[PDB]
Design a protein around this ligand. Structure first.
Ligand code: HEM
Length: 118
């Protein structure tokens, strides 16, 4: 992944997300420090039941998980919960109504996000 190109891909995320110092929540949660962060734990953000449940079931945003998540957020979260033994909690839908199908763009945007996490 190329972080330089990733910054350009992030333009597709900026309508709802912010990264950087004192980044604040908007329609979506701040993404500073999201790498390896438990899903649904960004301070002050009101998550969907499914995004919250996935984190409680063990979902952490490793680079691999973000890459697999971006092409279809709902599909990823529902499968994660089912595989974990919490299928009953995968009936809802995530508030993130956006998809990034292209593999390269996904790799690059994740490379960019890694710059803002330990
Ligand atoms: C390549 C594009 C984007 C990236 C990298 C991205 C990444 C993420 C990630 C990793 C999460 C989970 C964060 C957490 O659990 O703390 C998330 C949640 C969310 N994103 Fe995005 N996002 C992108 C674009 C968008 C856009 C454009 C929108 C909406 C038009 C959006 C709205 C949201 C919302 C509302 C949530 C919370 C979902 C929920 O609570 O169910 N995202 N995003």
């Amino acid at each position: 992944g190329d972080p330089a190109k990733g910054e350009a891909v992030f333009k597709k995320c900026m309508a709802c997300h912010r990264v950087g110092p004192d980044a604040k929540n908007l329609v979506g949660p701040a993404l500073t420090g999201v790498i390896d962060r438990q899903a649904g734990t960004a301070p002050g953000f009101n998550y969907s039941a499914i995004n919250h449940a996935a984190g409680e079931a063990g979902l952490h945003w490793t680079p691999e998980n973000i890459i697999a998540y971006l092409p279809d957020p709902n599909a990823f979260l529902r499968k994660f919960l089912a595989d974990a033994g919490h299928a009953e909690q995968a009936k809802g839908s995530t508030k993130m109504v956006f998809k990034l199908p292209d593999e390269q763009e996904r790799k690059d945007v994740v490379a960019y996000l890694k710059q803002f996490s330990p």
